[model samples]
Target: SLDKAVIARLRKGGEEFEVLVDPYLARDLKEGKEVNFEDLLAAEEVFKDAKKGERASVDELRKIFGTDDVFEIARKIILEGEVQITAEQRREMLEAKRKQIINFISRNTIDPRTNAPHPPSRIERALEEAKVHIDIFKSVEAQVKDIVKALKPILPLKFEEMEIAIKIPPEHTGRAISALYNFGGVTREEWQRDGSWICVMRIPSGMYGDLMDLLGKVAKGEALTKVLRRIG
Candidate 1:
C-alpha cells in the first residue's frame, strides 16, 4: 500500500523498499542517509546507462530503458532530490514532488466536513486550479498542511463555503489586500469618509479563524467580519 509505504518513512529506517534511483547522486535528509542511486542500481543493473553520462537525451533515456514513455522515467528520476541537477531535471523533480503531494493528500486526508477521502483526480485538478504554492525548501511531508489550507476554496467540501462582509478600519495593517486577492472572490466595495475599506467577498470559512487568531496583530482589531455560511 502506498499509504503504508509513505507511513513507513517515519518509522524505523532499516526496512527496504523498491524504487529506481541514480547511483552517483548521494544526498542527506532529516533522518537517514539517502542512498537512492546505490539502491536503484542494486535493484537493477543500470550501471551502463550511467557510464554513458549523467545527462541523457530523450532518445537516450528511452533507448536505454527500452521504452518511449517518460511518465515512468519522470517518476523514477524524482525518487530522491538530485543535487546540482540541470534546469530540465530540476523541473522534472519539482513536478514529481507536486504529484507526490497530490497522491499523499488524496489518500491520507478526507474532507473535514464529509469525512470521506477525496478522489485523487478531483483533488489534483482542484489543486491545479487553486494554483497552490509549493515550497521547494521543504519536503512534501512538511508542506501538506499548508497545501491543504491553500486548497480549501478549491475543495468546497474541505472548507465551509461562505460570503464575508468585512470593513477595514483606519490605519489598518496591510494583511487585508494580500489575503483578499490571493484567496477569495470580491463582490462589492466602498471607501468610507476616513481611510478604510468595506467589501463583500466569498472566502473559505476557516479564513476568519486565522484572522481572528491574530486579531490584535493583524488589522489591529480594526476589521469587522460578517460571515454567511453556504454549505449544502
Candidate 2:
C-alpha cells in the first residue's frame, strides 16, 4: 500500500524529470481519462531521481521543463514521458493482454468447415503453436486482424459475414423487421401468401449466435431461419 508507486519519466536536454505516481492513475491519464493531479501523484513531488528520492529544485524544473509547478510538470511527464512498470507488473500485464487477444480471436472468427466459433482454449493453443506475438501496449481489437492473418495458414479461421434466410410469422413481423435492421441488414425481403415476412440478410459470422438469440426472443422461437452461405 505504501510503496506501490510507479515512475513517470521525461527527458529534456540534459535533465531528466521523474514523478512518483499511482500505476493505475498514470495509465488512466495516459489513455486520455480524466484524473486529478492529487490522485495521480503518490508524493505530489517531481524527482531528479525517484529511486534516490531527490527532488528537483524549482530552478531546475523551470529551466528544463519550462515550468516550476509540480502538478504541471508531473502532468507533462506523464503525458509525454515513458511509464516504467515493474518486471512483475509487466509479466502479469503481458499474460492478461495475451488472453484478451485470444478471447477476441475466438469471438470474431469461426471454423470455416463447421461455421462455428473456435473455443478460447483451442485458439490459445493455436496462438501458441503459431508463435503469435502479442503487444502489451496495443489494443486487442487493433491487433486481432494481424493475428487472424497470421493464424489463417495454421488454423481454419473464417472472418466473414454469414448469410441467412429468415421467415418471421406475421405476429412478430413488425418488431422482427426492426431487430433485423439493427443487427445487420435485409438484403431482400418478400411477403408470403400467409402474411409472413421472409428475408435474406448478411451479418458477421461471429454475431450469428447473438443474432439467433435476439431473433428467438423477439419471435418467440417461431421464426424460421437457415444459413444460406458465408461471404468474405
Candidate 3:
C-alpha cells in the first residue's frame, strides 16, 4: 500500500530507479582495498526476509536462501550484486558490454546451419532471452566466459578465427570501410598513396563470406580478398 501510493504520487514527477548498490564487501572492495574489515550487526538485515533480530547464525543465514549456505548468499548479494555506478558509468558500461558482445559474436560466432555470421541484432535477441545483465562496474572482458555459458544453449555459437586480406579500389574505399566495421574485428587498414585501399582483419570464418559479398558489391567485383589463415 505504501509503495503503490508513493509510486503513483511520483508517477507525475517521473521518479524512477534501477538495480544498483555500493557493497561494503563487494568484489571491488575486496580487490581494491588494501585494508581488511568485517562486521555484521546482531539483527543484521541484509535482505527483507533475512534478518536476525537478536542473533544471527549459519542455520538462519542458510535458511535465507533455500538450499544456499551463508557464504553462497554472501557472494550472490554482496559480492556480485554490489555493483556501484552512476548513470554515466552505467551508460559507459552498457556501451562497453554491447561492443564486447558484438565483437565476440561477429569475430568468433557463426550460424551452424548456414555457416554464416549471425547479425548483431540476432545475437542481442538471444542475450535478452537469457536475461544477461551486465555489471555496470565490471569489465566486459571478465564476463565473456559466463556469457558463453549463457549463450551456448540459446544459439548455435561457433568461433572460427580467420585472418583475411582485402583490397578495395579507390572508388569503393568509403563503402568497404563501413562494411568492415559492421563485421567488428578490423586489426589493420591501409589507405595507399597509390590509390589502393588495403586492409587486414581477423574475423569469424562464417562472416568471411558475408564480408566478401559486401566487398563484392562495393568494389564492383574487383576487390582482391583472401582468407590468409584459419584458427579455431
Candidate 4:
C-alpha cells in the first residue's frame, strides 16, 4: 500500500518519466557513458511530432520506441529545439530534466537491502531549484498518521467502555469520528463502526501514554480506563 501510494503520488507529481528510464539510465548517465545516439535520433522523430503541435499519444509512441529513446527524443525537443542549443544551455537543461527523473526513480526503485523504496538521491539539491519538485505526499501522509495517533486517546471511547457496554459521550464520539478522517491507515469499518456511531481505534504502541493523559482530561476528572496494554 505504501509503495502504491508513493507511485501514485509520484505519478500525480508528473514523475513518470523518471520511472521509465531511471532503472537503466541513471547510473550510465552518471558514469558519463554516452547514450545511444540512434535512440536519440528515434526520439528526435517522435519529438518532432510533439513539437509540431501533434498530440502524440504516449502509449502509441511507446509501442514504436523504447522508453529511453522516447526520453531522449523528448529531452532534445524540449532543450535543443530545431536549432542547436549552446553546450552550456544544453547542459543546464539536461541537468534540470534529469534531476526530476532521478527523484522519481529514487522514490520508486526498490532498495536491494530492504526491498522498500528509499528517499530520492540528492534530495536537497533537487529541492533547491525553483522549478524542481518532489512528491512529499508520502512524508505528509506519515505526519498525519503521527498526529492522529497522538490525538487518539482523548477522542476514542476506551475498549473497556465498549466491552462493558457503557454509552460513549456524544462529544467524545464526534471527536473520534472526525479524527478518523485525519488519521492514516484507518479503515472504513473502523471509521464508521456502525451507523451513526464512531469507533475509537487502538493507539499505536508509542502513543498510548500521552493519549491516556489527554483522554483523562476530556473525561472531566474521571480516571480514564486503560483499554489496551503495550507489547514489544
Candidate 5:
C-alpha cells in the first residue's frame, strides 16, 4: 500500500522533488565557491603579515577573529578579497624564518656537552626571545638577501639544502662541534692524521655565524675560512 501510495503521489505532482533537489545542488555549489573565496582572503592576510615581518600566534589569531575557527576565519578573509601566496613562496618564507631562529639560538644558548653558550632551542624559543629584535633584523632585507646570495655558492645540495663546514683550532674543537650541532641538522665524521683530530661535518647553514664566532675565539681572533661546499 505504501509503495502504491508513493507511486500515485509521483504520478500526481512529484515535480516538486526535482525542484528541491536542483536548489540543494545549486546551494552546495555556491558554498564551495564561497569557501574558495574565503581561503584566498585568508592566505593573503597571512602573507601580508609575513612580508611585514610580523609574528602571529594562535592566540593572537583567535583574538583577531574573536572566534577559534581559524579555517573559517581565513576563508572569510579570502572572501574579502585578500591576495594569496603560492605554496612555494610560503615554504621559502618558512625556511628563512627557520634559518633565522637556528642562527639566533646557536649564537645565544650554551651546549651542555661543551658548555659553550647558545640559545636553548632553535626556532620556537629563539622566536620568543627575539620577538622585539625581529623587526630590526627584518628591516635589513637587502643585507639579508645579499648574505644569502653570497652563501649560495657553498650551500648544501641535498638534505633540505641545510649544511655548512668550517675549520677550527683543536682547543675549541669540542665546543665548535657542539655549537654546530645546536641547529639540529649536523652530521659528523673525523679523519685522524699524524695524531691530530681532523673533524669534518655537515651543519645547518644557519649555524655559520656561531661557527665563525667560535673560530675567531679559538684562533686568537685571526680570520678563519669557513667554507660551505655543496655536498650531497
Candidate 6:
C-alpha cells in the first residue's frame, strides 16, 4: 500500500531522483540481499519529487544515471540512494538493538564488587548514564567494545570466571545435579555411597549470584559451596 511505501532518494548534479519502494524490500536491497524489482518497487518510474508526482525526465535520467532503462535506473536509485524509513521502524530497531547490547553485557561482564553479573537493569541504567547510543545498523558484538569503554567510568565491571566446589545432599541430588550442570561445566564429580553428589565446576563470574540463588532454591540452602579460584 502507498501508505507504507518509502522514498529512496538520490541527489546528483543539482537534480533529485526518487523512487517509491516497499520499505522492507528496500532495506533488504540496501543490505546487499537480492530482491526482485517486481516486489521491491512500489512503482517502476523515477520521480523528481515523489510527493509531487512529477517524474524524472528521460534526459535527466540518462545524464545522471548514464542509462534511462527504468529497471536499471530504479535499481541504481534503490541501491545507491538513501531510503527514508518511518520513525516507528527506527524506534523498534533501536529497542531491539538496545536489548541485544544489554544481553551481551550481562553475559560477558561481572560486577567487581560482588563478582556477579550486573543485573540487566543495572546494565540498562549504566547505558543511560553513559548516554550510549545504539546503532541500529551495527552488530551487537561490534558495538560492545565502545559500550564497555563508555561504561567503565560508571560501572564496576570485570571479565573473569570462577571455579567452585559444590556438594548436594541425597534428597536433592537429582534436581540439584541438573542445575549444577546447566549452570557451568563440571570438571570433577563423584557420588558417595550415601547418595550425596559432589563436583567442582568452572563458570562465568558474572553468573555466581544466579548459580547460588538457583542452588539455594533447589537444595533448600543445604548445598555446600566454596570458591576454589577466580580466573581471568
The parts of candidate 2 lying over 4 Å away from their true place are 25-38, 67-81, 161-203, 217-219, 224-232
Residue pairs in candidate 4 whose N, alpha carbon or C atoms collide under 3 angstroms: 43-73
Q: Scored by Cα lDDT, where does model 2 land?
A: 0.84
Model 6 over residues 1-232: C-alpha lDDT tens digits? 7888888888888888898888777666655667798887778899999998999888888888898888788778776778788999778767887998898789778877866688789999999998998876566776888888889998978778888999999999989998877776787899999999999888777777778899999999999999999898
Off by over 4 Å in 1: 1-83, 156-232
Per-residue lDDT tens digits of candidate 3, residues 1-232?
A: 1111110000111311111123322334434433232321111233332212133344544554453343334434443333433456558657765777767766566677777778778878888888887664355556666776788787877777789988888888778778777767787888899788887878768667777777778778988987788786
Q: Which stretches of model 3 miss by more than 4 angstroms?
A: 1-107, 167-200, 206-210
TM-score, per-candidate, Cα-based: 0.35, 0.70, 0.45, 0.25, 0.26, 0.59
lDDT of each: 0.53, 0.84, 0.57, 0.35, 0.38, 0.84
lDDT (C-alpha) at residue 164 in model 6: 92
Error (Å) of candidate 5 at residue 18 is 38
Residue lDDT tens for model 1, 1-232: 2111111011112322222333223222321244443332323322223323233355554555565454344334334323333456557666876888887776556577664567778878988899887654357778887888888776844434457787878677367655555544666878788878888766444344444454445576667878765552
Candidate 6 residue pairs in backbone clash: 117-206
Candidate 5, residues 1-232: lDDT per residue as tens digits?
1111100001111111001111212222323532233322213223213334343455655655565454454444433332233455446555554566445444433343444434434334534443423321132332333433333343311121224444455655655556545634545645345322333445444354556666566555642354557332
Where does the lowest 10-residue lDDT sum fall in candidate 6? 24-33
Q: Write the per-residue lDDT of candidate 2 for residues 115-144, one digit (tens) a residue.
A: 888889999998899999887655677688
Number of clashes in every candidate structure?
2, 0, 0, 1, 11, 1
List candidate 6 stretches off by more than 4 Å: 1-85, 114-116, 184-194
The global Cα lDDT (0 to 1) of model 5 is: 0.38
